[PDB]
Structure formats: C-alpha cells, structure tokens
Copies of this chain bind each other. A is one copy, B any other.
Amino acid sequence: HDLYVDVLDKVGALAHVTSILAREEISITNLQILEAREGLLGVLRISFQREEDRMKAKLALGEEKYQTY
C-alpha cells in the first residue's frame, strides 16, 4: 500500500507531511524520498501496513493541498 506525494521542498515537506500523519494517528512502515534531479523538488513515497491508513493519509494530505497518487 503506497502513496506518492509531489513536493516542492523535500526537507520541509517531509516535516509537514509527517506532522499531518501524526495528527491523524496514521502509522507508516516506510518513507522514501525520490527525485529526478538534484535540488529541492521531489516525490515522497509513503508505505502503509493497511489500506485504511493509506486512504486516511490520502484524505488528510489532500485537505492540505498536496497533490497525491
């Protein structure tokens, strides 16, 4: 169960995204930071144990205006 989140600032977005997951009490298994080029832009790939956790994350991140897949 994976969710991919496009981000403009890998470092700051990582902190914001994990604070959102914490507030919603969503457990994750892994967080991978992907990039096509060196620089601050990237994709956060978040892995979950359960489908329910992925959907909860998708909703919460969507509400904070992150584009998610």
Contacts and interface: CB of A to CB of B under 8 A. Distances in A.
Contacts of A14: 18, 21-22, 28
A8 interface: no
A21 B21 CA distance: 17
The winner among A10, A12, A14 for most chain B CB atoms within 10 A is A14
A19 B33 CA distance: 15
B27 A11 contact: yes
Nearest to A19: B15
A27 to B, nearest CB: 6
A29 B19 contact: no
Interface of A: 10-12, 14-15, 18-19, 21-22, 25-33
